[PDB]
Amino acid sequence: MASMERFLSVYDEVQAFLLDQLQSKYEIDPNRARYLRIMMDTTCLGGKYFRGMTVVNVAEGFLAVTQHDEATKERILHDACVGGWMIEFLQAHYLVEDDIMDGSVMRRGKPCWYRFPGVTTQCAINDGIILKSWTQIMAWHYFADRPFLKDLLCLFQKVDYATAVGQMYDVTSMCDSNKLDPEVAQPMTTDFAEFTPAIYKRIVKYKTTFYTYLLPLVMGLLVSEAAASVEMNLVERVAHLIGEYFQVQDDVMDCFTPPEQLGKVGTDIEDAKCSWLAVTFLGKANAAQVAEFKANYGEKDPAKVAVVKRLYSKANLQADFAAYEAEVVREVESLIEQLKVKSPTFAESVAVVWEKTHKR
Amino acid sequence: MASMERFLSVYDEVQAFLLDQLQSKYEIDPNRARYLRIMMDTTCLGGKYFRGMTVVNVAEGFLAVTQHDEATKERILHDACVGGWMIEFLQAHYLVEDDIMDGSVMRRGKPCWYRFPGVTTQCAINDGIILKSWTQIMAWHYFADRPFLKDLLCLFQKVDYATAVGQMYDVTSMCDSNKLDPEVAQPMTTDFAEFTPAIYKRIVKYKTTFYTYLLPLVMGLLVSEAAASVEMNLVERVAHLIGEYFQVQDDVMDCFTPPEQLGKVGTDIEDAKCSWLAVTFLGKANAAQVAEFKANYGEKDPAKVAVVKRLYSKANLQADFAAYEAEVVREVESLIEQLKVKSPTFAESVAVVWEKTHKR
Numbered sequence: 001m002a003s004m005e006r007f008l009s010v011y012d013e014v015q016a017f018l019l020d021q022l023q024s025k026y027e028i029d030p031n032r033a034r035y036l037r038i039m040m041d042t043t044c045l046g047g048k049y050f051r052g053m054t055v056v057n058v059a060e061g062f063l064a065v066t067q068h069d070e071a072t073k074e075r076i077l078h079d080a081c082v083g084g085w086m087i088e089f090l091q092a093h094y095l096v097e098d099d100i101m102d103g104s105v106m107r108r109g110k111p112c113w114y115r116f117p118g119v120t121t122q123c124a125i126n127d128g129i130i131l132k133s134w135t136q137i138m139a140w141h142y143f144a145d146r147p148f149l150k151d152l153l154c155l156f157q158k159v160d161y162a163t164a165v166g167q168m169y170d171v172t173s174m175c176d177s178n179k180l181d182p183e184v185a186q187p188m189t190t191d192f193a194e195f196t197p198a199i200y201k202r203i204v205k206y207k208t209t210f211y212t213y214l215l216p217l218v219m220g221l222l223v224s225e226a227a228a229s230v231e232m233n234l235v236e237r238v239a240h241l242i243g244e245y246f247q248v249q250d251d252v253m254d255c256f257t258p259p260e261q262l263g264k265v266g267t268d269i270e271d272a273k274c275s276w277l278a279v280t281f282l283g284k285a286n287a288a289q290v291a292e293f294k295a296n297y298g299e300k301d302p303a304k305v306a307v308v309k310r311l312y313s314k315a316n317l318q319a320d321f322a323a324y325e326a327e328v329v330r331e332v333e334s335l336i337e338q339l340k341v342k343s344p345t346f347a348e349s350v351a352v353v354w355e356k357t358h359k360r
Numbered sequence: 361m362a363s364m365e366r367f368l369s370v371y372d373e374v375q376a377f378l379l380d381q382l383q384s385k386y387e388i389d390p391n392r393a394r395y396l397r398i399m400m401d402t403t404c405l406g407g408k409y410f411r412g413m414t415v416v417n418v419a420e421g422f423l424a425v426t427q428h429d430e431a432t433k434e435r436i437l438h439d440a441c442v443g444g445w446m447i448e449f450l451q452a453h454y455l456v457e458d459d460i461m462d463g464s465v466m467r468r469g470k471p472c473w474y475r476f477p478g479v480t481t482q483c484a485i486n487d488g489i490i491l492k493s494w495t496q497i498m499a500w501h502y503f504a505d506r507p508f509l510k511d512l513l514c515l516f517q518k519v520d521y522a523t524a525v526g527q528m529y530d531v532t533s534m535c536d537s538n539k540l541d542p543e544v545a546q547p548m549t550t551d552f553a554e555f556t557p558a559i560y561k562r563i564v565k566y567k568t569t570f571y572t573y574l575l576p577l578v579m580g581l582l583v584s585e586a587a588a589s590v591e592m593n594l595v596e597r598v599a600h601l602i603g604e605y606f607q608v609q610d611d612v613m614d615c616f617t618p619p620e621q622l623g624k625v626g627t628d629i630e631d632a633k634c635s636w637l638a639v640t641f642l643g644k645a646n647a648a649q650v651a652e653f654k655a656n657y658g659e660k661d662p663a664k665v666a667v668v669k670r671l672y673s674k675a676n677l678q679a680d681f682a683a684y685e686a687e688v689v690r691e692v693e694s695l696i697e698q699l700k701v702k703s704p705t706f707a708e709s710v711a712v713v714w715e716k717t718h719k720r
């Protein structure tokens with residue numbers, strides 16, 4: 001049975017389970033169940049399922065080299081599909097809440113969930129809470145007697161925490177750290193001293209890489225009972241590296257991918273985000289270029305934004321991007337090789353993860 | 361050592377632990393650690409600690425009838441303090457996010473967290489997320505090798521889910537259920553057909569009673585290794601009953617307790633909440649009174665609000681309140697008696713919980 005079809009079948013199964021449990025154990029009525037069904041569909045479906053399919057793909061690789069009864073294969077694949085849905089649902093939680101936080105307008109060519117007429121922020125904040133709570137319900141129900149349950153829950157907790165920390169690093173990245181203060185309204189950085197490669201690396205490591213790459217690879221390992229086929233420090237290193245590369249790409253596209261293809265209007269420049277482009281631009285700018293950057297960055301006025309995009313184009317950031325890409329390719333292929341020492345299988349799953357990321 | 365002092369000592373301990381772990385394992389800087397320290401203090405401290413102290417009080421009761429080494433007593437008390445902080449922190453999460461959702465202005469005589477100048481909704485939504493994530497960090501660190509860890513985590517998950525469900529019941533309570541629809545902006549009920557005792561009971565059961573009464577009593581039991589001293593159906597029943605009574609009180613005070621004493625300006629009437637007062641009023645109203653209620657409820661205009669408070673005063677809701685109170689006293693004392701069959705100790709802890717609630 002093909003992995004994607006399996007994964008989608010399991011969505012239906014889990015959806016039905018969560019809603020039936022709301023009726024039998026939490027006194028829900030049919031109309032609020034319907035509202036939550038539509039919310040689940042609208043917030044969890046319509047992407048490529050990269051995260052959750054990685055869990056499946058990792059598990060499928062181990063199945064090919066590991067003796068099991070057919071029923072065990074099925075159990076493992078099912079677990080991998082559940083686990084992948086846990087991660088899809090965690091992402092849905094973060095997309096819902098971050099859209100609200102960031103005043104976002106669209107997502108994937110449709111309005112952000114909080115912007116639907118019958119939702120509003122009042123409901124959407126809670127809908128996002130429920131999204132995450134469903135991840136735990138999934139685990140407790142489907143993995144109740146599994147030997148990996150402890151480890152999976154503990155990992156998932158850490159990933160989720162690291163992610164929330166990353167949001168804090170991301171939305172405060174345009175403020176001077178020494179002036180953070182709940183009591184005082186926060187000014188934008190005027191010096192941009194904290195727009196550095198190391199700082200940017202921290203933002204991106206936490207904001208995305210733990211849930212997007214680390215958690216899908218290690219959850220694959222856990223449902224497979226295959227933690228011993230890897231040196232977990234290598235897995236972490238490669239996860240964080242590939243994920244950085246994924247985010248740099250995302251940053252580039254925010255500025256340069258036409259809205260129709262992007263699925264939304266990018267506003268990094270207006271929001272003064274510590275983006276790859278801004279950090280790299282500042283890494284190579286002369287005095288005049290820095291000064292012009294500072295006079296135009298983080299302003300909604302479209303003329304100011306155009307001045308910033310000109311600076312980017314004129315600074316030939318493409319070249320710095322190719323150089324970065326080249327190093328990352330180098331360092332990923334290296335990490336894969338170190339991973340082949342304990343598991344050619346797991347190494348190959350990483351290689352696929354890298355290909356899907358490096359091309360899109 | 362006195363229980364409250366112990367409980368407060370443990371706050372300091374846990375605070376230091378969570379922040380030190382952010383520095384050693386999550387790459388936090390000193391200024392963002394400071395921001396999270398102030399957030400934790402401002403969102404978790406300044407209430408009466410009823411929830412978390414109930415865990416302690418339950419545990420202290422078992423210690424008085426149960427042989428242990430002194431070091432075991434201390435371990436149990438510490439666990440109870442941690443567990444009580446888990447519940448305080450869960451409440452802090454819900455207060456932060458519900459203030460944002462509900463457009464609230466003040467809480468405990470101070471501005472809601474999202475309204476602090478250097479916070480804003482962008483940060484506050486995430487701060488609330490972190491608040492809950494800290495509950496799990498507490499558990500995983502302090503209860504790592506505890507025999508109750510599984511059960512505590514599983515219970516805590518259910519409580520938290522039930523609570524999020526309760527928020528959904530509470531904020532949609534003034535909409536006709538058949539017209540819930542993410543696609544369509546939601547009108548206020550014109551008939552108020554769903555302002556019934558059974559519906560109201562559902563809202564309040566989920567919105568408050570699971571985290572405020574159920575979770576503190578059962579967490580006391582769990583840290584005590586004393587689940588067998590109770591018939592958990594009795595515990596649930598008494599929890600849900602006392603908690604309902606707590607919420608009815610809260611509803612009354614929203615309308616009639618002067619803002620300075622309340623700690624905030626009550627706006628249930630303006631927000632069209634399915635409150636005890638509204639349900640009871642409608643339970644006894646004649647045709648003219650219903651019609652006047654419907655012409656004035658759920659409107660911000662202060663004259664309309666005054667018309668609603670007059671209707672309440674003129675309908676002598678005090679009398680219905682005493683009758684309700686009388687029944688609840690009756691049914692609580694009954695449940696306590698059933699609890700004495702397996703544990704006079706646990707029964708007495710319930711009796712204290714009831715006294716603190718019934719008097720404030």
Ligand SMILES: Fc1ccc(Cn2cnc3ccccc32)cc1
Binds near residue numbers: 159162386
């Ligand atoms: F998913 C994650 C994977 C690793 C880390 C970092 N880390 C390393 N050791 C740890 C012990 C306790 C807590 C965090 C820890 C964070 C999140």
Ligand SMILES: Fc1ccc(Cn2cnc3ccccc32)cc1
Binds near residue numbers: 025026
């Ligand atoms: F804290 C709680 C305590 C009891 C219930 C209701 N309930 C009863 N049995 C259950 C099995 C699975 C899930 C929920 C369940 C909800 C929350």
